């Protein structure tokens, strides 16, 4: 099916507390496999997935050098951003970065992403054409002009279409046992009263992969959002996700409420009735 | 693989 790979980086400045804490992680569509924490003593890109350990010492020696450059490339980058926004050198700020590639069913390139961020706000983003940019503010238009003096687009464009995709199938085909397969959820319902004739009905669905799932509480063929609480998807830590949907009903009307689960791993959308 | 990085 459709899968993707993402790379997330985070640099958090700290005045007087040493070099800024740099955290960089590598993400496949919904499974993390590599990480790099600056304050760790190893100072090398450490794996976090079993199937990625096949790559030889050249891979780690390459990925270590490329990201340690990014740490210093972003460390000195903040000292420029403080000048751009005329901030205090004793202030604390955060730098964020993300860019990856999505593919189709048979390995076809689908889309390309590249977006930076400064203190939770966008700074510069590569357009969908991958051959132009979009600066957010006037301070970003300075860097946007640079990165236009150099031909940064066709390097990142050739990367998002190339070594991002060309290296992606190597990751998937190494680990087709764990990534390409989908685990359907384990579904059940609970029952919890609060008064003599009013209770809380919560629909449970546990252990599914990936996280895209739809839950809807319907009453006699009519859906309901009023008096419904739906928490965001939460991870289990092993490679599965969880989500519950809540609805408060008065007593005597429970059998009419229906919980429905729609998920990719299920060939048929589930219909649950208490 | 982790791509390159350019300063501002």
């Amino acid at each position: 099916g459709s899968h993707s790979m993402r790379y997330f980086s985070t640099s958090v400045s700290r005045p007087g507390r040493g070099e800024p804490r740099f955290i960089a992680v590598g993400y496949v569509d919904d499974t993390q496999f590599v990480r790099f924490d600056s304050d760790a003593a190893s100072q090398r890109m450490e794996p976090r997935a079993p199937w990625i350990e096949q790559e030889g010492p050249e891979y780690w020696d390459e990925e270590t050098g490329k990201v340690k450059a990014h740490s210093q490339t972003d460390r000195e980058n903040l000292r420029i951003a403080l000048r751009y926004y005329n901030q205090s050198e004793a202030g604390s700020h955060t730098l964020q970065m993300m860019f990856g590639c999505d593919v189709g069913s048979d390995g076809r390139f689908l889309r390309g992403y590249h977006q930076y961020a400064y203190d939770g706000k966008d700074y510069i983003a590569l357009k969908e054409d991958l051959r132009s940019w979009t600066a957010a503010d006037m301070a970003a238009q300075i860097t946007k002009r640079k990165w236009e003096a150099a031909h940064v687009a066709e390097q990142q464009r050739a990367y998002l279409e190339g070594t991002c995709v060309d290296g992606l199938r190597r990751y998937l085909e190494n680990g087709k046992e764990t990534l390409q397969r989908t685990d359907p959820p384990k579904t059940h319902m609970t029952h919890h009263p609060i008064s003599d004739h009013e209770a809380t009905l919560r629909c449970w669905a546990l252990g599914f992969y990936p996280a895209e799932i739809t839950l809807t509480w319907q009453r006699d063929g009519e859906d309901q959002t009023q008096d419904t609480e739906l928490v965001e998807t939460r991870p289990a830590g092993d490679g599965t996700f969880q989500k519950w949907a809540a609805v408060v009903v008065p007593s005597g009307e429970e059998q009419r409420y229906t919980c429905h689960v729609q998920h990719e791993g299920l060939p048929k959308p589930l219909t649950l009735r208490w | 693989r982790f791509p390159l990085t350019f300063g501002w």
Epitope: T64, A150, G162, T163 | -
Partner: T-cell receptor, first 114, second 113 residues
């Protein structure tokens, strides 16, 4: 436009060596290479204006390279042996020019003797 | 992840055409360089290409053309001078494998008068 020092050096086997490289101004990257007699250069390491980022694992730990102040580099190889006698190159780049052109220096040829 | 330089030794007469081939692995779109090394001194950069112009005109009358369909970046010169007798290296930098350069096997060229 790179300047290296020295060009030719000769030592007895089993000792340490030290050379310097003064690359171009406003260039923040420094790649070290080792070229045998009449062959393609062999990669050693590269820096980004402060410190060492990558080193060839096929090179032993007695190879020491450092660029402390980010303007000039230093190279130190311990326990000299004739198998390491070759020309050692120093190059610089910008990391802001997308072609990332590397400009090399006049190099330094090493000859070790017993 | 390889660089192939087929022409390993060439000796032509002065004033003739010249072409040196350099083929890389049919993978990504990497950086490309052609360096010359005189017997004594270091390497002198001739030309480079990543912008997107398949034809590149360089120094010393040397011009190079990029052909992605063949994955070749071949050095050319219309009429070789008598001074061009040196070792010619084509160097690439594999974009995903770091900014380090990957050098070729080396071509030793001499010119007869």
């Amino acid at each position: 436009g790179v300047s290296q020092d020295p060009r030719h050096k000769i030592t007895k086997r089993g000792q340490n060596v030290t050379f310097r490289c003064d690359p171009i101004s406003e260039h923040n990257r420094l790649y070290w290479y080792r070229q045998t007699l009449g062959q393609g250069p062999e990669f050693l390491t590269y820096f980004q204006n402060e410190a060492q980022l990558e080193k060839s694992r096929l090179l032993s730990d007695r190879f020491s390279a450092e660029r402390p102040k980010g303007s000039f580099s230093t190279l130190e190889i311990q326990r000299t042996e004739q198998g390491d006698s070759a020309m050692y190159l120093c190059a610089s780049s910008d990391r802001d020019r997308v072609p990332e052109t590397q400009y090399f220096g006049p190099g330094t040829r090493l000859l070790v003797l017993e | 992840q390889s660089v192939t330089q087929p022409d390993i030794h060439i000796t032509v007469s002065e004033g003739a055409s010249l072409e040196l081939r350099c083929n890389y692995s049919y993978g990504a779109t990497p950086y490309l360089f052609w360096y010359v090394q005189s017997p004594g001194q270091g390497l002198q950069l001739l030309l480079k290409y990543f912008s997107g112009d398949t034809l590149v005109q360089g120094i010393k009358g040397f011009e190079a053309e990029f052909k992605r369909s063949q994955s070749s970046f071949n050095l050319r010169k219309p009429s070789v001078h008598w001074s061009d007798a040196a070792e010619y290296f084509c160097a690439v930098g594999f974009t995903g494998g770091g900014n380090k350069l990957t050098f070729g096997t080396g071509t030793q060229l001499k010119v007869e008068l």
